[PDB]
Amino acid sequence: SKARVYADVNVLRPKEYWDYEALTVQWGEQDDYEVVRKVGRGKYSEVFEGINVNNNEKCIIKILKPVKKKKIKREIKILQNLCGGPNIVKLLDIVRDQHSKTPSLIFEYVNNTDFKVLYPTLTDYDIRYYIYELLKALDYCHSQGIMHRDVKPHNVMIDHELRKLRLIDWGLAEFYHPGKEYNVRVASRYFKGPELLVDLQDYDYSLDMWSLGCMFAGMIFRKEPFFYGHDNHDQLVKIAKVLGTDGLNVYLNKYRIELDPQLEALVGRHSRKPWLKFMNADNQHLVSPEAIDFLDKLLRYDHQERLTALEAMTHPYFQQVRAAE
Amino acid sequence: SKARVYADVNVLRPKEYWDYEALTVQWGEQDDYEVVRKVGRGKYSEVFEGINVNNNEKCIIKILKPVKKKKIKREIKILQNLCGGPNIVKLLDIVRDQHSKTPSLIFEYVNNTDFKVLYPTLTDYDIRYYIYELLKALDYCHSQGIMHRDVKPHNVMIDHELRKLRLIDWGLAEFYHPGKEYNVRVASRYFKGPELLVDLQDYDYSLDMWSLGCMFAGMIFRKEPFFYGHDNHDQLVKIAKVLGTDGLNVYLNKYRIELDPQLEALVGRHSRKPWLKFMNADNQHLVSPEAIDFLDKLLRYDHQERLTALEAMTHPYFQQVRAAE
Ligand SMILES: CSc1nc2c(Br)c(Br)c(Br)c(Br)c2[nH]1
């Protein structure tokens, strides 16, 4: 498999663009930034709102829990290539604890409103708008040869008042290389594309669209996560129970990929579930023919069938938002 | 039915934008333009290359065969609204024979190469490129609330050397009005969308995409016309024999449209014909998974399922052309 778009970005760019292991970090002053209050935390870092001692501007300090120098160079190089692009979290500085080497990435500040409390307030248009904004981030990084590999609400910071959105956490992000096999233990479970659940290692930008699709199904259907699987195997089961297994079968055959006997019998056989069957009084006003049509073109077993970010932005669903533009 | 996009363009614009009957033509000097040589001719006009006596710049003089003042105002008003837009034939002046009222529309000159001789020379990329260019014309007029209703090679002037393309002949063009029934005797037969063949009068911009789809199938498969039907009825037969009749059935049912018993039994029952079954040594190099995928998304019975012009431009098929941009 090869990405249907932006497949040669890296092959035509200077090696120093993608050769992240060959990055020599320019550490700044661990001082210019003061932690003001812990505002978040993944298992790969603790996050705090912070102040830039110099200009007093707010900032976000991401202190990294012991990371292999090679992975940090990846996240850093990726942040550097995408810095300036639409809705990409701006990396303002890299610093380190003098005494112990602990890295902290300094980013632009985003007065974010956690999704668990923001999404239920979102109007039909709001969702359309924000998803749209997220699509600019995605189409942009994809156009730079980068797979985020970790799309999800948690990684989409949103300032509702300013309507400013930023795709964050490029720690699981990777450069796309035509015909390269990648680890399928990326992205959060509930957003893991089928290809990740069936060890189809030669994936691409499309991985993200599925993630987005999951995030979108969650927002319109008000069901977060949309595919709540306790474990990777069960994750493929929550999917098959929605997309149907015959679709899965076609996917598996097209890419000559087998399934492990155990999971195989666990995913059993399920008929495709109409998207409208997820509709209820609570989300009826967010569901629409276009929302369904857009979502249907996102959640495709075949990563090759999924809408590319650029195509998603032109789907009529986004027409009103584009018109405001 | 209502267009999935640009549906409210006219409803939000000043009435003088679409009220073409209320146009008061500003006739110029029938003199400034001299016919140099007949270069074309439809049944609604004779076309000649011409010279602008003033600046000596070449021009195209379209002398209209007796037209109802109401239709001329339509073509003229439409040409005026779209003048300046991407690849839209530029209307430079409207004049009239003093002695007899015969109208002549003066347009920009295009050193065109008839398609019957140009297309066979076109490379894979050339086709992609030109179709792309045509899509800008289409997405633009559609975004102004106008249905061309007559897309076809004959109406796409092309200067291969300059790679300049213009969508011409807006004589069958009309303003789009949400929920309005239009005459289905528009566009040339071989490019008539199914909706035109089954009297689905509430069509929209999508009509054009089918036309384009036909033109595209002709160019990649080297089969002009692609759907060669001797008459409107037989036109729906050449289609059903390709898209299959069950698809047709779904279309007919969704829009509660019956078929006339006569044609009904004439279209009989046919299975869908894989697009790749139109491939042969002569067009093999122009056919590709993306070309097929793009075409498949154009030739849909359901005008609502067809790619909108804006969506077609973002289809991976056009990726290389967009990259050159
Ligand atoms: C889970 S709470 C949280 N808020 C964040 C903001 Br605002 C930014 Br900007 C960045 Br970078 C990260 Br990482 C964040 N993590």
Ligand SMILES: CSc1nc2c(Br)c(Br)c(Br)c(Br)c2[nH]1
């Ligand atoms: C069929 S030959 C022909 N060539 C044309 C050119 Br060049 C232009 Br510009 C326009 Br407007 C029209 Br109508 C044309 N008709």
